[PDB]
């Protein structure tokens with residue numbers, strides 16, 4: 001019945017980006033323990049957790065291109081046939097697949113989605 005077990009996209013620690021993870025504990029006072037998909041764990045405030053699973057079509061996101069540089073793109077599709085989520089991300093009229101954990105949100109991109117998808121609460 002609780003928020004535990006939900007897949008989320010959440011601000012990591014006090015960094016500039018939100019990353020994919022899972023809520024593993026309600027630690028009280030509107031904070032949650034998260035297990036991030038890369039294996040790291042931290043406590044995150046509810047205001048900094050997005051509940052959209054998956055991130056929806058036409059969302060502006062960030063991803064690594066060519067194993068070289070991070071830049072923005074737009075979500076244009078999803079694949080979950082294998083039981084693992086992949087996103088189709090469009091950059092400059094061209095699309096490429098990205099595993100769930102490779103799609104991240106800058107503070108601007110993630111804060112944008114609070115009104116629609118934030119855990120919260122928000123006053």
Ligand SMILES: CN1CCN(c2ccccc2N)CC1
Pocket residue numbers: 012015019036037038040
């Ligand atoms: C979710 N996951 C947590 C660890 N992060 C990290 C790794 C190595 C250096 C800095 C940072 N922030 C990457 C994102």
